[PDB]
RNA sequence: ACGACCAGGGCUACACACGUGCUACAAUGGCGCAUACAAAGAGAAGCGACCUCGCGAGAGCAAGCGGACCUCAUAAAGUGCGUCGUAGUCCGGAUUGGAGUCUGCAACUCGACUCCAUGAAGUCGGAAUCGCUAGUAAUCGUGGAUCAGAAUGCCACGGUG
């Protein structure tokens with residue numbers, strides 16, 4: 001089973017296997033299975049090809065691929081090329097939305113070194 | 115303890131079997147004051163020990179208790195519960211049942 | 222962040238936009254409104270945004286519409 | 301017989317033929333380390349500056365602690381073991397000088 | 405002028421260090437559905453039901469109540485069934501983007517919360533060090549003071565134990 005989301009989902013339940021695509025969490029995977037008509041506890045076994053391509057059309061409304069990687073990235077490129085204050089935060093790897101930088105900024109800064 | 119020499123508390127026994135010793139066993143596995151989820155694991159572990167690992171459920175626990183021997187019974191029950199947590203099986207009722215099976219056959 | 226019923230802008234800076242459209246572009250306009258929402262009628266102008274001690278001119282760009290003027294002025298010098 | 305004697309006194313001042321002054325020192329066998337914390341003992345050596353912040357934990361005694369990157373630099377051979385064994389002799393001396401008390 | 409007024413900024417910075425906490429690393433659990441049991445307080449420029457709309461934060465309409473009456477207010481763990489089957493996972497939720505709610509002249513610096521998506525480190529922690537002898541420890545939620553708004557802090561209150 002190869003979706004428009006070319007990366008192959010694991011041979012498990014349907015709502016878990018759709019989560020592996022970049023851009024589909026737990027809630028959006030429930031919305032696709034509810035709109036198609038497939039139960040969430042149905043595995044990749046017995047999921048016929050007539051039931052896979054109807055999941056390709058429901059996911060086709062949303063851009064969820066490396067094309068979604070560049071749209072998140074170029075939205076940040078809109079900030080950094082503009083010269084705004086928020087664009088300066090992303091270029092140095094600092095927190096943006098109000099987190100402190102005294103201590104406990106290990107996610108943004110990267111590993112410690114004196 | 116230097117001056118205050120007192121005894122130790124006598125808790126109410128097992129409501130299912132009437133066993134004083136099994137009431138101290140469920141309190142060791144009990145964490146966060148969850149009595150209702152602790153005794154359900156201990157009862158399901160002993161029923162696995164009774165039906166598929168030898169009859170006389172009250173005696174089958176005692177043979178597993180005897181090989182690992184108030185404080186002598188206390189340290190024996192604590193060694194069963196703490197070794198059952200670091201196993202490879204799926205649930206706590208399955209892990210502690212295999213520990214009592216190994217303690218009955220002293221291995 | 223802000224509710225959709227009316228984007229906020231100060232009254233003194235809104236008056237500075239209206240004279241700038243009619244009389245043409247001028248020298249960069251000194252102001253203190255770091256909280257105003259940028260409207261499309263400001264595209265092209267240069268607004269000097271106060272950042273604590275001085276005024277930094279900001280050339281308004283098309284994609285700046287909707288943002289704040291405080292998002293273009295660093296308030297501290299880092300070394 | 302096998303020792304040295306301190307005959308000359310504390311300090312006598314003179315001048316160079318080019319410029320500057322000289323200061324003589326007494327024969328001194330004393331070690332006053334009552335000044336500051338043992339964090340400043342880590343700063344008292346040049347090459348150990350560049351190896352800080354490389355060990356496992358953020359605080360480290362560097363003697364009985366597992367994963368000391370300073371001890372890995374001595375075991376590699378870039379730092380001689382004479383300086384490392386004398387370094388913890390300084391730390392064990394502070395377990396013996398501090399005993400009674402002293403403060404300025 | 406070491407006084408006083410106002411605007412904006414700082415008190416929230418960031419290569420680091422230390423103390424104090426929360427949530428975790430999970431099957432004594434995670435999630436979905438069904439469902440049972442608290443005590444103690446707060447409320448008039450206030451608590452705000454019912455009804456209606458939105459996935460939701462909420463919004464509209466609009467009673468009751470200065471209160472053992474009304475409102476906040478459906479306590480949570482637990483119980484019953486189903487599911488995942490020991491893995492960086494349906495663990496854990498950081499960080500970031502996008503779209504919004506509410507408070508207030510006004511949420512950029514620097515607010516709370518919701519929704520979508522992303523899913524860091526972490527698989528029980530060295531030397532060292534702390535609390536506690538019974539309804540205590542552990543853990544579960546609730547309420548209050550401060551407060552326009554802003555609780556992992558603090559003060560109280562019970563549930564299991």
Ligand SMILES: Nc1nc2c(ncn2[C@@H]2O[C@H](COP(=O)(O)OP(=O)(O)NP(=O)(O)O)[C@@H](O)[C@H]2O)c(=O)[nH]1
Nearest residue numbers: 304305306307308309310311324325326327328329
């Ligand atoms: N062979 C030899 N002897 C030397 C040399 N330098 C010094 N000495 C001798 O060593 C001795 C000690 O010298 P001195 O300078 O007095 O020592 P000091 O350190 O000043 N002593 P103090 O602690 O009393 O001040 C003297 O007898 C001196 O002659 C050297 O290069 N070679």
Ligand SMILES: [Mg+2]
Nearest residue numbers: 019021023024
């Ligand atoms: Mg996904």
Ligand SMILES: [Mg+2]
Nearest residue numbers: 494495496497
């Ligand atoms: Mg999770």
Ligand SMILES: [Mg+2]
Nearest residue numbers: 115118536537
């Ligand atoms: Mg006491």
Ligand SMILES: [Zn+2]
Nearest residue numbers: 355360368369
């Ligand atoms: Zn070290």
